Amino acid sequence: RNLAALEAKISEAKTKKNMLQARAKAAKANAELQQTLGGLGTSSATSA
Amino acid sequence: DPEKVLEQAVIDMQEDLVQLRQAVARTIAEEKRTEQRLNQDTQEAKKWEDRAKLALTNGEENLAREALARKKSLTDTAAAYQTQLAQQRTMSENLR
Amino acid sequence: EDRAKLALTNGEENLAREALARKKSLTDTAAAYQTQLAQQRTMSENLR
Amino acid sequence: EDRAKLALTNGEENLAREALARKKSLTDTAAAYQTQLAQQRTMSENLR
Amino acid sequence: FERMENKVLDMEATSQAAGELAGFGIENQFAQLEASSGVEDELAALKA
Amino acid sequence: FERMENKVLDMEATSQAAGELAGFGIENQFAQLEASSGVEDELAALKA
């Protein structure tokens, strides 16, 4: 029974952590998209 | 000279649009993957429900409730992936 | 258009509209060539 | 505007207003070029 | 089979990339093509 | 997972920075764009 419980713990923790990391990476990618959209170099063209 | 600065900005715009295209493609890939995952998971629950029906045939209530636990886990994961895909769709439209 | 008439004989409306598409392309090309020939005639008279 | 008419055929009011935006941009550019050409004609006569 | 299914997942990623590519503004022109078909369809009634 | 959630919190800080950036006086011009849409919308009634 301890082995059954431990395997359940291992599987759930591993998969949950992996998916959490993947979604966090997706979120940070989206945040980088937002930064790039905000990060517009209009100043240089205006100076030219 | 303003000419050179404007030309350089125009050039940089070319890199920027390509980077945004790459980001959009990444978003498309992620939404595809999550859709596939949730779709398969939905059917896994039905398969375990079929095992539960086998249990219903004779005796093994324990097996039936185990299948129900698998179903609960799968549906929770499906709801989480549905939320994730909603976020992906929103972000993809924002990027578009 | 004769092929389109064959289609008119029985059924193949798809073939008729395909023939019509060919007709449209051909008439557009004919108008373009008419304009081109007008330009050629004008230039030829200029050169003469 | 012809694309806008295609939109007028069925539904796509969005396409029609997009075509109208293109029309607005094109006519603004045309007016700017008309002013530019007036300046060019004046300068050319001055030089002549 | 897991390696092969990872390749399958790469194919699914390609499908998602194509879907992300699915957006095209030129699609309106396709409708015009359909409108053109109507012309031939009208001619189908005309043959009567 | 706490390290990863600290990274997530950094992403949330980026979101708060974007919100602090959200203020723009140029937003009025966007409304003009919407007004421009109205023109095309009016033309939609005009097509009738």
Which among A19, A32, A41 has the least Cβ separation from residue B12? A41
Burial (CB count within 10 angstroms: exposed 0-12, middle 13-18, buried 19+), residue C13: middle
A38 at B interface, C-beta within 8 A? no
Give the chain E residue whose CA is nearest to the CA of C16: E40
Method of elucidation? cryo-EM
Give the chain C residue whose CA is nearest to the CA of E47: C8
Rounded Cα distance between C21 and C7, Å, is 14
Contact assessment for residue E31 and residue D6, using Cβ atoms and an 8 Å cutoff:
yes
Burial (CB count within 10 angstroms: exposed 0-12, middle 13-18, buried 19+), residue E1: exposed
Amino acid symbol at F39:
V
Structure tokens at C48: 């003469």
Structure tokens at B61: 């209530």
Write the DSSP symbol of residue D5.
Answer: H
B22 at E interface, C-beta within 8 A? no
Cβ-Cβ pairs closer than 8 A, D with E, add up to 14
What CA–CA distances, in Å, run from B39 to B34, B74, C8, C32?
A: 8, 11, 48, 54
- Please tell me the total number of residues recorded for chain F in this structure: 48
Contact assessment for residue B94 and residue B31, using Cβ atoms and an 8 Å cutoff:
no
Q: What angle do CA B81, E4, E21 make, to 5 degrees?
A: 55
Amino acid symbol at C6:
L
Deposited resolution, Å: 6.7
For chain F positions 17-36, those within 8 Å of chain A (CB to CB) are 18, 21
Write the DSSP symbol of residue E37.
Answer: H
Rounded Cα distance between A30 and A24, Å, is 10
Contact F36 D21 (CB under 8 A): yes
Contact assessment for residue E28 and residue D3, using Cβ atoms and an 8 Å cutoff:
yes
Rounded Cα distance between B61 and A23, Å, is 37
- Please tell me the total number of residues recorded for chain A in this structure: 48
Closest listed residue to residue B8, CA positions, set A39, A48, E36: A48
CA distance, residue A48 to nearest chain B CA (Å): 3
DSSP letters of E4-40? Answer: HHHHHHHHHHHHHHHHHH---TTHHHHHHHHHHHHHH
Neighbours of chain C (3+ CB pairs under 8 A): E
Phi, psi (degrees; rounded to nearest 5) at D10: -160, 110
CA D15: distance to chain centroid?
17
Rounded Cα distance between F7 and A27, Å, is 10
Most F CBs within 10 A among A15, A34, A40, hence the mutation to make, goes to A34
Contact assessment for residue B78 and residue B41, using Cβ atoms and an 8 Å cutoff:
yes
Contact assessment for residue B93 and residue B53, using Cβ atoms and an 8 Å cutoff:
no
CA distance, residue B44 to nearest chain A CA (Å): 16
Give the chain C residue whose CA is nearest to the CA of E40: C17
Contact B33 E15 (CB under 8 A): no
F4 at A interface, C-beta within 8 A? yes
Rounded Cα distance between B75 and E19, Å, is 26
Neighbours of chain F (3+ CB pairs under 8 A): A, D
Closest listed residue to residue E28, CA positions, set F45, D4, C25, F37: D4
Contact assessment for residue B31 and residue B85, using Cβ atoms and an 8 Å cutoff:
yes
A33 at F interface, C-beta within 8 A? no
Neighbours of chain A (3+ CB pairs under 8 A): B, F
Contacts of F15 in chain A (CB under 8 A): 31, 34
Q: What angle do CA F14, F17, F22 make, to 5 degrees?
A: 125
Q: Which residues contact F1 (CB under 8 A, 6 or more apart)?
A: A17, A20
CA A28: distance to chain centroid?
5
Which residue is it, tokens 């949330």?
F12
CA B44: distance to chain centroid?
16
Rounded Cα distance between B92 and B95, Å, is 5
Q: Which residues contact B13 (CB under 8 A, 6 or more apart)?
A: none
Closest listed residue to residue C1, CA positions, set C31, C33, C27: C27
Neighbours of C35 (CB within 10 A): 10
Burial (CB count within 10 angstroms: exposed 0-12, middle 13-18, buried 19+), residue F24: exposed
Neighbours of E13 (CB within 10 A): 18
Contact F4 A21 (CB under 8 A): yes
- What SS3 state is found at B59? coil
Q: Which residues contact D15 (CB under 8 A, 6 or more apart)?
A: D3, D4, D6, D7, E28
CA distance, residue D6 to nearest chain E CA (Å): 6
Helix residue ranges, H only, chain D: 2-9, 13-47
